[PDB]
Amino acid sequence: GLEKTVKEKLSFEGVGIHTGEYSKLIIHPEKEGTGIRFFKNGVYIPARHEFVVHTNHSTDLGFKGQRIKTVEHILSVLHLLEITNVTIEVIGNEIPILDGSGWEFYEAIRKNILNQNREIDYFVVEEPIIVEDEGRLIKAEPSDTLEVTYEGEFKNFLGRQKFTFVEGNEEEIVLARTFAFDWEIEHIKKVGLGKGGSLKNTLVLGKDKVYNPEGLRYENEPVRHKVFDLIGDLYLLGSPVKGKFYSFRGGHSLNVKLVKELAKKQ
Amino acid sequence: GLEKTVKEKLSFEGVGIHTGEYSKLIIHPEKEGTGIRFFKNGVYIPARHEFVVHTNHSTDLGFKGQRIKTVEHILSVLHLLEITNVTIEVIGNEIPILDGSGWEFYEAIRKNILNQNREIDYFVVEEPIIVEDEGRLIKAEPSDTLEVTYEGEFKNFLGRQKFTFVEGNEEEIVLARTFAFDWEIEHIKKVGLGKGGSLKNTLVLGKDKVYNPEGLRYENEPVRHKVFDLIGDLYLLGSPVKGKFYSFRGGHSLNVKLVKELAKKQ
Ligand SMILES: CCCCCC/C=C/CCCCCCCC(=O)O
Ligand SMILES: CCCCCC/C=C/CCCCCCCC(=O)O
Ligand SMILES: [Cl-]
Ligand SMILES: [Cl-]
Ligand SMILES: [Cl-]
Ligand SMILES: [Zn+2]
Ligand SMILES: [Zn+2]
Ligand SMILES: [Zn+2]
Ligand SMILES: [Zn+2]
Ligand SMILES: [Zn+2]
Numbered sequence: 001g002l003e004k005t006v007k008e009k010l011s012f013e014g015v016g017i018h019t020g021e022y023s024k025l026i027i028h029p030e031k032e033g034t035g036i037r038f039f040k041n042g043v044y045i046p047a048r049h050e051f052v053v054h055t056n057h058s059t060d061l062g063f064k065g066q067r068i069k070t071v072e073h074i075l076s077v078l079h080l081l082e083i084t085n086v087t088i089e090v091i092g093n094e095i096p097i098l099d100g101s102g103w104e105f106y107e108a109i110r111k112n113i114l115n116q117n118r119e120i121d122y123f124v125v126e127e128p129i130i131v132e133d134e135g136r137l138i139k140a141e142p143s144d145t146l147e148v149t150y151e152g153e154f155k156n157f158l159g160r161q162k163f164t165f166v167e168g169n170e171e172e173i174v175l176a177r178t179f180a181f182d183w184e185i186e187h188i189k190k191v192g193l194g195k196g197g198s199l200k201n202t203l204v205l206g207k208d209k210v211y212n213p214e215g216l217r218y219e220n221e222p223v224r225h226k227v228f229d230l231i232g233d234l235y236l237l238g239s240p241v242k243g244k245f246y247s248f249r250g251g252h253s254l255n256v257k258l259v260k261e262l263a264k265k266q
Numbered sequence: 267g268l269e270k271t272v273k274e275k276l277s278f279e280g281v282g283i284h285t286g287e288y289s290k291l292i293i294h295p296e297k298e299g300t301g302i303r304f305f306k307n308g309v310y311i312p313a314r315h316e317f318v319v320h321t322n323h324s325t326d327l328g329f330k331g332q333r334i335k336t337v338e339h340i341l342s343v344l345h346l347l348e349i350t351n352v353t354i355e356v357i358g359n360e361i362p363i364l365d366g367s368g369w370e371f372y373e374a375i376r377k378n379i380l381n382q383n384r385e386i387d388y389f390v391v392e393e394p395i396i397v398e399d400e401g402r403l404i405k406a407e408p409s410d411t412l413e414v415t416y417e418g419e420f421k422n423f424l425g426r427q428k429f430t431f432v433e434g435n436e437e438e439i440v441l442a443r444t445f446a447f448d449w450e451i452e453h454i455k456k457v458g459l460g461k462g463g464s465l466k467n468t469l470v471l472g473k474d475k476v477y478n479p480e481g482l483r484y485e486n487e488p489v490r491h492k493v494f495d496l497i498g499d500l501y502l503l504g505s506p507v508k509g510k511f512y513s514f515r516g517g518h519s520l521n522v523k524l525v526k527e528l529a530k531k532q
Binding site for chain 1: 448451452455456464465472475476477478479
């Protein structure tokens with residue numbers, strides 16, 4: 001694959017699911033070898049694991065006193081389309097959540113791709129690895145293609161189920177929205193988070209009922225979104241990834257723990 | 267008491283808890299003997315029981331093809347302050363829910379009262395009456411003052427409790443917000459309602475947890491709000507009421523059923 005960027009600036013705006021504040025993005029084109037980086041109040045924050053400053057309920061980055069919340073969805077989309085050189089200008093403290101999935105981001109970036117002059121230097125998983133924690137587990141092994149599987153064991157009706165993404169099936173996960181169980185909402189709100197949450201950007205799941213009037217887009221939309229998240233967190237490795245991943249009940253924290261292991265080893 | 271109206275137009279705007287649409291109110295002053303009436307698309311809708319067209323999840327009025335949803339909170343405030351002559355102009359299909367209580371309405375109307383030249387012709391409960399339905403019950407008897415008691419028997423932690431409003435204690439109920447149990451939200455949304463609902467205008471109560479980060483304003487804020495509602499529904503009798511009411515698990519439907527009984531009898 002050839003490094004890619006955008007043919008022109010693309011902007012998005014809306015509220016942040018956590019801050020509740022309005023915010024706007026502006027993806028700028030960049031030359032070969034630049035990499036993915038955010039820009040806020042004059043500071044460049046590389047979309048790399050060394051800048052992760054928070055992983056509960058979202059993956060946040062920060063540098064030199066400047067922070068940006070929830071970068072997983074836009075990074076996931078960038079990872080899927082293989083965009084490698086862009087500066088994500090952020091006016092606000094968080095990435096707009098939009099509808100909760102990566103659809104809008106995907107559709108716009110997909111038709112504004114600009115191939116550049118250089119082969120992509122993929123981060124390739126060279127040997128097997130496993131990272132565990134409180135029953136949660138993520139496994140990674142060598143592969144010529146990006147393959148991600150997420151298995152969930154839910155306390156509500158979703159019960160136990162898994163989903164697998166393989167290159168070419170981008171559209172099966174870019175629509176999967178963000179979700180939360182009703183029993184977690186009180187916590188999110190108490191710790192100063194989820195201020196921008198609503199049924200318009202979050203699928204609220206009860207012990208055996210879906211609150212959202214629109215129901216689920218897929219009987220397993222939740223685990224599909226989990227794959228979407230993992231794929232975004234993986235891009236923090238610094239470049240498009242080539243490996244086979246299996247995540248059992250993983251989350252941003254474990255995802256990042258894995259990312260750091262991989263980087264460290266190589 | 268002397269009939270009252272406002273010293274000048276007072277307007278309020280916001281979203282409707284049910285429609286989700288924006289809407290604005292404009293309370294206009296009116297001469298003696300006018301009464302409380304709404305105005306929409308050229309049609310005057312008297313704030314009277316004969317115009318009630320819906321009572322599930324809200325008290326709605328309608329006439330000659332024009333409808334206005336959720337009139338209980340503004341009417342309650344009008345009933346408490348004893349405003350008797352005004353035209354509530356409605357731009358939209360529902361009364362703005364605002365924060366879910368009658369605070370904003372109360373504060374504005376309270377300092378713009380204009381006493382007029384005529385004694386109020388109070389609707390006076392002349393004999394005892396009881397209206398029942400599926401265990402729910404409302405009782406009314408003679409009284410020189412408006413006295414309203416609401417007793418609830420909740421399936422969640424609130425358990426069993428009651429509250430009593432007596433003239434002079436207006437402020438103890440004008441702040442009590444709208445509430446709903448998480449287990450009802452799916453229904454509201456399915457029947458095309460609660461489209462404007464959020465934790466910003468509704469207290470969502472779980473089986474033993476309060477979702478709202480701000481918690482309850484009173485350990486019994488729910489039953490206080492029920493009294494607030496009943497007082498608004500009673501004003502549909504056509505004029506300030508003087509009677510002693512006791513409501514056991516009552517709701518808009520029973521409230522109106524009572525209102526109609528009373529009117530019919532007298
Ligand atoms: C005001 C009414 C209601 C609905 C409130 C929804 C609660 C907010 C939940 C926050 C979701 C956090 C998970 C998002 C992270 C991700 O998708 O990677
Ligand atoms: C779990 C997340 C969600 C919050 C969504 C809030 C839904 C609002 C429900 C509609 C309330 C109806 C009762 C209002 C009538 C009244 O107070 O008289
Ligand atoms: Cl947490
Ligand atoms: Cl948004
Ligand atoms: Cl209100
Ligand atoms: Zn937390
Ligand atoms: Zn997500
Ligand atoms: Zn007007
Ligand atoms: Zn109903
Ligand atoms: Zn109410």
